[PDB]
DNA sequence: CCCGTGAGTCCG
DNA sequence: CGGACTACGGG
C-alpha cells in the first residue's frame, strides 16, 4: 500500500539514535536537516513515496547547500523549487558555524552535486511523477559535519571510533528502509555508498542487487568532463532506462 | 528632529539579536551594559544626542572600569559624573565574575583609555555640549567579555566563528547608527574600529567618510608617552578641531 | 593595542 | 610546483 508513513518512521527513530552520539575532535558542528527541516522532507516523502519502488538512488549525506537547506537529497535549492516543487518551512541548527548558515530556499548557493544530479533526471523523465513512479532517492547518512573552520568532513574523515558506531547504525535503518520501500535494485550515487550498501544489505541477508554511478560532485574530475552523458550510460548498462521512461 | 530615540531603537534591536547569541570555548563570562546599565545609557543618549551630528568616534567594545560599569562609551567614572554629569541606576549581569563585580558609579577603579579620551575633549572643549553641538560617541559592539580568570577578551581575541557571527550583527548595527545620525565622518578609535567601520560602510555604500585615531589603552605602548598631543595632531589634520571648538 | 609572520583553504 | 585571502607572540 503506501511506504511513506513507515519510510518517515524509519527516519525518526534514526534521527533518536543519532541525537545521543558524541562527536569530537575535528569535528566541531553537526547538522540534521531531518530535525530542522524536517516539513520540506515529510512533503517530499508525502508527495513522492505513495508506492512501492524498483530503485533506491543511494548517496552518503548531505552537502552544505542542497540537502542541508532543502531537506531533500541532493536538494540544490532552484531544482526543489521549481522541479519537485517541494516547499516547507526551515528553521536553524542549535550551533551554525558563520560560513555555514542555513537560509533553507533563500540559500543562494547551489549545491553542484545537487543540480546535475536532479538536472539528469529532469531531461530524462520530464515530470518528476514519472521518475518517482519506480524509483526513490535517500543518502545514508542525515548529518554533515565540520570543522572548526566550516570545511567539510565526510564520514570517513571522522574518528574511527565515532565513524564505525555512525556508519553501523546508518546500516540498520538502510536496510529498514530497503525492506519498507520493496526495491529490487539500489544504485550507490559514489564508490561509498555502493560498497556501503552491498556490505549492509549482506549482513543482513537481503538479496536486493547492489550496483553504483558516478557521483556528480565537482571534486571529481571525472564528473566535470560530462557527468551526464557518463551516468545515461550507466544506467543504460543497468538495464533501469525504461523505468525511468 | 532629534535621532535620540531612533538611535535607542537601533540599540535595542541590536540588543535583541545579541541576546540570542551563545559563546563558549575560552568565552565564560559575558556583560551587556546596555541591559544592566540601560538607564544612565538612556541619560547619555537622550542629553547629547538631540540633533543629527557631522562626527562619530567609534570605539571597538567597554573596558571593565569603564562602560561596563557606567552605561556610557569610553565610559570612565569620573569623567562620566563629573564631566558629562551623567548619572542613574546599575544593576548587574546574571552571571559575574567574581574578580569584575559591577559596582556602577561605585566603582573604584579607573579605566585609563577612557579617563585619556574624555580628559582629551575636557581640554579641547571646555563644557561638554560645545562637544557635542556635532560630536557623538558610540562603540561596535556593547559586549564585553571574559575568560575563566576573568581575563577581558576583545572581539579580535575571540576564536574566529564566535567573532565573525558577533561582528556581523553589529556591523549591521552600526550601518543604521550612522544613517540615523546624519553623520558625515567616523572617526575609529584605533586601526580595529577603523577598519572595521570602513569595510561596513563601504559595503552598504553609505555617504560617510571613515578615518581614525591612535587607541588610548594602556596596552598600546605607543600611547604610553603623550597620547594627548599626539591625538591633538591628528584631529588637527582631520580638521575637525573647528567642529571641536 | 598594532603589526609581522605565517598556515588552512580554495581554485565548481 | 602558485596566489589570494585572512593565530598569535614581541614590542
Known amino acids: 500500500e503506501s511506504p511513506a508513513d513507515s519510510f518517515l518512521k524509519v527516519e525518526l527513530e534514526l534521527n533518536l539514535k543519532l541525537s545521543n552520539l558524541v562527536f569530537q575532535d575535528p569535528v566541531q558542528y553537526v547538522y540534521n536537516p531531518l530535525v530542522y527541516a524536517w516539513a520540506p522532507h515529510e512533503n517530499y516523502v508525502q508527495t513522492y513515496c505513495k508506492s512501492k519502488k524498483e530503485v533506491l538512488f543511494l548517496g552518503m549525506n548531505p552537502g552544505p547547500f542542497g540537502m542541508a537547506q532543502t531537506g531533500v537529497p541532493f536538494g540544490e535549492v532552484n531544482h526543489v523549487r521549481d522541479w519537485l516543487q517541494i516547499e516547507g518551512p526551515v528553521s536553524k541548527p542549535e550551533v551554525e558555524h558563520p560560513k555555514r548558515r542555513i537560509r533553507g530556499f533563500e540559500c543562494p548557493q547551489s549545491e553542484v552535486s545537487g543540480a546535475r544530479f536532479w ?36 564520514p570517513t574523515d571522522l574518528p574511527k571510533a565515532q565513524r564505525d558506531t555512525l556508519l553501523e547504525i546508518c546500516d540498520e535503518a538502510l536496510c529498514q528502509a530497503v525492506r519498507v520501500l520493496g526495491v529490487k535494485l539500489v ?59
Do not use: Y
Not at 547518512?141 to 568532513?153: A, D, Q, W, Y
Not at 555508498?193 to 554511478?213: C, F
Not at 556528480?216 to 521512461?245: C, D, F, H, M, Y
Open 187 to 245: 544504485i550507490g550515487v559514489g564508490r561509498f555508498s555502493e560498497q556501503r550498501a552491498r556490505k549492509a544489505l549482506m549482513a543482513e541477508g537481503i538479496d536486493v542487487t547492489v550496483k553504483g554511478i558516478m557521483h556528480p560532485s565537482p571534486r571529481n574530475p571525472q564528473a566535470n568532463k560530462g557527468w551526464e552523458g557518463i551516468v545515461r550510460g550507466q544506467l543504460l548498462e543497468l538495464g533501469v532506462l525504461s523505468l525511468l521512461t
Open 119 to 154: 538536472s539528469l533526471f529532469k531531461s530524462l523523465c520530464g515530470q518528476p511523477e514519472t521518475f518517482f513512479k519506480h524509483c526513490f532517492v535517500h543518502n545514508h547518512c542525515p548529518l554533515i559535519f565540520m570543522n572548526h573552520s566550516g570545511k567539510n568532513l565526510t
